Design a protein around this ligand. Structure first.
Ligand SMILES: Nc1ncnc2c1ncn2[C@@H]1O[C@H](COP(=O)(O)OP(=O)(O)OP(=O)(O)O)[C@@H](O)[C@H]1O
Lengths: 56, 73, 104, 140, 104, 61, 122, 131
């Protein structure tokens, strides 16, 4: 019965460390979306400045 | 209408066919630029621009003539 | 005349900026006093927060009257400063005359 | 001053620039004595952030006039307020971006503005979609 | 009751007169509100002058330093209630002095 | 504590799958606009050569 | 002095020198007279670089050799552009202020700065 | 080794140096503090301080305060502080007779304090002006 108490709190703390882990992955994934999106716009801007200077 | 190709003028102080618009301002303030913008905005319409430059500098009138010739005016 | 008034107004602006610089040091000339005071006041209450302290400065008189000291300056020309102080003064004495507080 | 200004001005510019003239007079009046009272008032702070931008969009380079559709579009986007969150340093780059975007991508707005000679709401809707597209393309 | 109306250094652009209660004080080394909100969470003290441009502005510059711990066993003389009754007038004088200096 | 931990892990891993979808698809829009803006700027280069050769011919006339 | 007459980056260099000078002009009774209470970091960079530019602008003349002891040098357009491009964008802040005074080109100022540092080790 | 003194006023700091031998009043009695003194908070009332460190004594006049003796630093926080060689002797006697004259109008709770304050204040002016 003490082992089953440990199993109850063990499942619960497993869900708890899992939600901390997925929250870390959540902030990582959202900053990765922002990074790749703003970075793609930065790529396009730098590329257009380069090509327009060259053709000019 | 006869739009001068300016935002402020053609926006809130309009100028029509037959409405005298005195362009009153000091020296080296941008009035000749206003008149040249008005003239260059008539690229397509039936607007036969006439322009007289009383007692203006030779470099000024020659430069504006060059601007007119390059802009297809 | 308008030139002379212009230059003396710039003059009083300069000396006003100077005395404001002085006042920011007159504050730090009393800050360590303040913190050495209030840390004693607060953290030393742990031996006295049990017992009844019973200071007249901390005593609760039955709330009847209020004194309202307004802190005004002595120099003129300052702008809306003194009149804003008087306006908050008379607004508080107007707010206090409906509750029946009989202010001084 | 224009004696006969309203008579020759077309209705598109009227219905898009009456509010601009109002808020421009209002910005010129909020300009002086600006600090002591209206320091963080929401109406005056918004009118300042959209009236500094009013003069920003009211600027121009010499020898580069803008025909009527560009004028109605550039003034509509200033009257609605889709630039208040943008930078004051980057108003005009977004301006030429939206200008050339409607100049290339959208071919219906020019036809509607030329034909109707007024501010037709279908042109307004397609213009609004193009403005939101350029808004996203520049904020991101 | 004795309460106090004085100004502060919020901005050169906005002077705001606040009506602070003085004489009935909470013992915690704090001031309170006229209703007892304890506004001393809004201390924001010890400005200094600095700029970003030509005009000279305020920069109220939130909390900088602090040095409390306590003494573990004081075992003082002088009858504790009377020690704190003797300490309160200096603190009240500190509040009055800071009020007049911030008004100036 | 059982139901709180359960619903909390569930909603947060759901938010993680939504963040995955958002990341991948906004990256898809990025890769779309990359090719599109490249075609656009090189079209602008052809516009540039057309305009400068046109004013060249204008000076020739 | 028009951007689309003489060069946009030239006009930006000139306009930024005018902006830094308009900063220093109004900041004179702010920091240089009374207050001086750490005006800013970005203001201190502008004040230091403004004094650098004010040393840098004046230059030794040809005809003033026998007059007030100044050897003669000649400075071009793009050279002045690059000199103020270096000084405005904050790269040569470490050199002494009088290393820029009474000098011609920017490389000549850097050479004089190294001579004064060889004096500073003396 | 030598205890550190801090005579303080709300505006300025008069004394901040050290001292090896003092005599200071408190509210109930008075305490004398020599080096290596245990932490003892001393509620000093209106009263001068006799102060000695490799010299003959000086009076440092105080007018109501409190002193938190820390470890090797004693924190004397007073509202009015000065030295007895600065407050004038015969003008302190002037203040003494002025206070003892104006005291006899103490016929109220409001005026008992602002006349007994005059009494003890003039007294603690003279006791430093003489010493
Ligand atoms: N919108 C503008 N953008 C950029 N530069 C401008 C603009 N308007 C005028 N300028 C510049 O200002 C200068 C003066 O313009 P303009 O000649 O129109 O004023 P002016 O009063 O007619 O001068 P003046 O009568 O002394 O010849 C011109 O060199 C022009 O290039």
């Amino acid at each position: 019965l003490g082992d089953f108490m440990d199993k109850r709190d063990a499942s619960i703390k497993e869900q708890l460390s899992g939600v901390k882990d997925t929250s870390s992955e959540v902030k990582q994934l959202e900053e990765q979306a922002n990074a790749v999106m703003r970075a793609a716009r930065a790529e396009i801007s730098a590329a257009l400045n380069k090509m327009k200077k060259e053709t000019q | 209408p006869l739009q001068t190709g300016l935002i402020a003028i053609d926006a809130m102080i309009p100028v029509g066919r037959g409405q005298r618009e005195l362009i009153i301002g000091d020296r080296q303030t941008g009035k000749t630029a206003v008149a040249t913008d008005t003239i260059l905005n008539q690229q397509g319409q039936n607007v036969i621009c006439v322009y007289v430059a009383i007692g203006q500098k030779a470099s000024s009138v020659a430069q504006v003539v060059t601007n007119f010739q390059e802009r297809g005016a | 005349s308008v030139k002379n008034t212009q230059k003396i107004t710039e003059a009083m602006k300069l000396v006003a900026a100077a005395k404001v610089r002085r006042a920011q040091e007159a504050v730090v000339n009393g800050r360590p006093f303040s913190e050495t005071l209030v840390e004693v006041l607060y953290n030393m209450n742990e031996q006295l927060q049990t017992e009844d302290v019973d200071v007249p400065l901390t005593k609760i008189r039955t709330v009847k009257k209020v004194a309202l000291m307004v802190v005004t300056g002595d120099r003129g020309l300052c702008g809306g400063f003194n009149n804003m102080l008087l306006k908050k003064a008379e607004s508080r004495i107007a707010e206090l005359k409906k509750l029946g507080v009989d202010y001084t | 001053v224009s004696r006969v200004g309203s008579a020759a001005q077309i209705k598109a510019m009227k219905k898009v620039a009456g509010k601009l003239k109002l808020e421009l007079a209002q910005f010129a009046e909020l300009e002086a004595f600006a600090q002591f009272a209206s320091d963080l008032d929401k109406a005056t702070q918004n009118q300042l952030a959209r009236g500094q931008r009013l003069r920003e969009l009211l600027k121009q380079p010499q020898s580069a006039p803008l025909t009527v559709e560009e004028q109605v579009m550039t003034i509509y986007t200033g009257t609605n307020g889709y630039l208040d969150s943008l930078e004051l340093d980057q108003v005009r780059k977004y301006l030429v971006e939206l200008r050339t975007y409607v100049k290339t991508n959208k071919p219906e707005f020019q036809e509607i503005i030329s034909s109707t000679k007024t501010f037709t709401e279908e042109a307004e809707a397609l213009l609004k979609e193009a403005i939101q597209e350029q808004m996203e393309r520049f904020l991101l | 009751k004795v309460e106090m109306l004085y100004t502060k250094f919020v901005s050169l652009v906005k002077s705001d007169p606040v009506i602070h209660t003085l004489l009935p004080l909470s013992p915690k080394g704090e001031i309170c509100d006229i209703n007892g909100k304890c506004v001393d969470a809004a201390e924001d003290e010890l400005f200094r002058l600095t700029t970003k441009e030509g005009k000279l502005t305020v920069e109220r510059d939130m909390i900088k330093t602090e040095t409390p711990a306590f003494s573990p066993i004081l075992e003082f003389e002088q009858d504790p209630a009377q020690i704190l009754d003797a300490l309160l007038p200096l603190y009240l004088n500190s509040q009055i002095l800071r009020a007049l200096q911030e008004s100036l | 504590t059982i139901r709180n931990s359960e619903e909390l892990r569930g909603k947060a891993i759901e938010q993680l799958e939504k963040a995955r979808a958002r990341l991948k698809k906004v990256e898809m829009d990025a890769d779309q606009f990359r090719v599109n803006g490249y075609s656009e700027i090189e079209r602008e280069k052809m516009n540039l050569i057309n305009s400068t050769y046109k004013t060249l011919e204008q000076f020739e006339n | 002095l028009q951007p689309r007459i003489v060069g946009e980056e030239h006009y930006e260099i000139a306009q930024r020198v005018k902006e830094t000078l308009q900063r220093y002009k109004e900041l004179q009774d702010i920091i240089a007279i009374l207050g001086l209470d750490e005006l800013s970091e970005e203001d201190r960079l502008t004040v230091a670089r403004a004094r650098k530019i004010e040393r840098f602008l004046s230059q030794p003349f040809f005809v003033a050799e026998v007059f007030t002891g100044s050897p003669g040098k000649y400075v071009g357009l793009a050279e002045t552009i690059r000199g103020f491009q270096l000084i405005l964008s904050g790269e040569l802040d470490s050199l002494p202020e009088q290393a820029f005074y009474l000098v011609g080109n920017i490389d000549e100022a850097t050479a004089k700065a190294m001579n004064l540092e060889m004096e500073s080790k003396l | 080794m030598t205890l550190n003194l801090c005579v303080l006023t709300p505006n300025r700091s008069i004394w901040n140096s050290e001292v090896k031998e003092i005599i200071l009043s408190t509210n109930s009695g008075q305490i004398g503090v020599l080096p290596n003194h245990a932490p003892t908070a001393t509620a000093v009332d209106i009263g001068i301080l006799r102060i000695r460190l490799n010299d003959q004594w000086l009076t440092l006049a105080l007018m109501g305060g409190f002193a938190r003796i820390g470890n090797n630093e004693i924190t004397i926080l007073v509202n009015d502080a000065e030295r007895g060689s600065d407050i004038d002797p015969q003008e302190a006697q002037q203040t003494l007779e002025i206070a003892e004259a104006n005291l006899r109008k103490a016929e109220g709770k409001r005026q008992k304090i602002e006349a007994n304050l005059a009494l003890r204040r003039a007294r603690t002016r003279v006791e430093a002006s003489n010493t």
